[PDB]
Amino acid sequence: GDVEKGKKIFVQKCAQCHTVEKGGKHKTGPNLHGLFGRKTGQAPGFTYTDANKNKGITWKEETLMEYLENPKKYIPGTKMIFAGIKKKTEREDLIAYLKKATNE
Amino acid sequence: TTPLVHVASVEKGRSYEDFQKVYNAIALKLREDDEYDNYIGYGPVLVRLAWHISGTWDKHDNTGGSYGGTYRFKKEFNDPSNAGLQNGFKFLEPIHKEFPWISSGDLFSLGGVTAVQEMQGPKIPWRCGRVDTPEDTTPDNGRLPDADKDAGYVRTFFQRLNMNDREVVALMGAHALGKTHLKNSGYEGPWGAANNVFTNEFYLNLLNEDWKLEKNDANNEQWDSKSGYMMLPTDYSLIQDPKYLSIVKEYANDQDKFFKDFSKAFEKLLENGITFPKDAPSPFIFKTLEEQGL
Numbered sequence: 001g002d003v004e005k006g007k008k009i010f011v012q013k014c015a016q017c018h019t020v021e022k023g024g025k026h027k028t029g030p031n032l033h034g035l036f037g038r039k040t041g042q043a044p045g046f047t048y049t050d051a052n053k054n055k056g057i058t059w060k061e062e063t064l065m066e067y068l069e070n071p072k073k074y075i076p077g078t079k080m081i082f083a084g085i086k087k088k089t090e091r092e093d094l095i096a097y098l099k100k101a102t103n104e
Numbered sequence: 105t106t107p108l109v110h111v112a113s114v115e116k117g118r119s120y121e122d123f124q125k126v127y128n129a130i131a132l133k134l135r136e137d138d139e140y141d142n143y144i145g146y147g148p149v150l151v152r153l154a155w156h157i158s159g160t161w162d163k164h165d166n167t168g169g170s171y172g173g174t175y176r177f178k179k180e181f182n183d184p185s186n187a188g189l190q191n192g193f194k195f196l197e198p199i200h201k202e203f204p205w206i207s208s209g210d211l212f213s214l215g216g217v218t219a220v221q222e223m224q225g226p227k228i229p230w231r232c233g234r235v236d237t238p239e240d241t242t243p244d245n246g247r248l249p250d251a252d253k254d255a256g257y258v259r260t261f262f263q264r265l266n267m268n269d270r271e272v273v274a275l276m277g278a279h280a281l282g283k284t285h286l287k288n289s290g291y292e293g294p295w296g297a298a299n300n301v302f303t304n305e306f307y308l309n310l311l312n313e314d315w316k317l318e319k320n321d322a323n324n325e326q327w328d329s330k331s332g333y334m335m336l337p338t339d340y341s342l343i344q345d346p347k348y349l350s351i352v353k354e355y356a357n358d359q360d361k362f363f364k365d366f367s368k369a370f371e372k373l374l375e376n377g378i379t380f381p382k383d384a385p386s387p388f389i390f391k392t393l394e395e396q397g398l
């Protein structure tokens with residue numbers, strides 16, 4: 001839906017751990033630029049977990065739509081301590097905002 | 105004088121199995137309705153109705169408290185001290201309608217247990233048995249604290265509810281949650297960064313930021329960090345006193361302790377004034393959604 005509303009989502013549940021702009025320092029989490037159309041454990045400079053890089057998948061709309069329900073579920077033994085968003089609307093609203101924010 | 109007694113009484117034929125359902129219902133909505141107050145969700149406000157209902161107790165005469173669940177009546181309900189809480193009440197209601205047999209009081213306090221546990225916080229034992237009391241049991245507005253005072257006032261405030269310094273400091277760490285609203289309390293700003301996740305950030309924010317005293321559009325003064333957090337005058341006392349200070353550092357350092365002290369004090373908070381028989385069930389430890397894989 002919105003990037004508008006999607007924006008709020010991000011500040012609130014994730015910005016505590018990630019930058020979205022290229023040259024966004026990595027804090028407890030990688031920079032999220034270069035997301036849509038990229039693989040796991042992809043961010044150059046981050047101390048990923050085998051488990052991550054190795055999920056070996058493209059970071060795409062629906063892919064997120066899944067992930068966002070259950071980060072743990074979708075990828076065993078990781079460091080991202082987030083319990084996923086469970087709804088679809090707001091998972092959808094965050095996914096929008098991202099396409100923007102994570103590239104241009 | 106010589107007080108009133110309130111004895112718990114299980115909602116006729118209710119089991120531990122009925123309770124988890126009341127619990128779940130709330131946990132599930134908490135997840136439905138997470139849009140409220142910018143994606144904060146209703147958790148925080150629930151940790152705070154819990155307290156506002158409980159916080160009217162007076163160990164002198166054993167009046168107020170969580171038992172009679174009088175918040176459901178216009179005097180308490182409209183106490184200016186309760187401004188904000190009507191949001192958490194309307195969130196509770198439909199639930200109250202699905203489970204008509206629960207006391208307002210158990211609803212209210214369970215409300216707070218649910219939220220804590222669902223925000224990655226510590227398990228909290230709970231006891232059913234609060235019974236709804238007649239409208240004439242609602243204490244007068246004004247047994248709740250002000251946010252403009254000192255360590256002094258804060259130590260003394262908690263003595264009317266048999267709370268000691270270790271216990272008031274531990275409850276105060278609940279400020280990691282939510283935020284203040286200029287429109288309800290005359291304060292604006294969160295206490296930290298994850299305000300819907302249960303942790304000890306309060307204490308580190310206290311200890312590490314550059315508090316600066318500034319005055320607001322409500323014309324109250326409040327400490328402001330340039331990190332975009334605030335600290336009420338009274339949250340500031342915890343560091344302006346060596347006793348409270350000693351504890352802040354202790355919890356700033358070890359969360360598993362902080363957490364251990366909170367379940368204890370929180371439930372003590374929820375239990376003042378209630379007489380729990382023999383022919384009474386022990387505190388329940390409800391299962392979070394995450395453990396029922398819901």
Ligand code: HEM
Nearest residue numbers: 013014017028029039040041042048049052078079080082
């Ligand atoms: C809520 C919104 C969030 C979004 C959309 C998000 C997105 C992501 C994505 C897509 C990845 C995988 C990167 C890749 O392989 O290309 C990731 C990893 C990670 N995120 Fe998040 N994240 C969010 C919240 C959080 C939060 C709240 C934290 C708190 C610490 C966090 C910390 C991390 C960590 C530590 C990793 C790395 C896991 C590993 O490689 O071991 N994220 N995040």
Ligand code: HEM
Nearest residue numbers: 148149152155188250251275278281282283284285288289
């Ligand atoms: C020292 C005594 C206390 C004072 C003076 C105080 C004062 C306040 C004020 C003025 C607000 C903001 C009202 C609003 O703007 O909505 C607030 C929010 C809150 N209080 Fe405290 N409080 C105290 C004790 C407690 C205790 C004992 C707890 C928990 C058990 C607690 C939990 C909270 C929470 C979670 C919030 C956030 C509310 C929201 O986000 O809607 N507070 N408090």
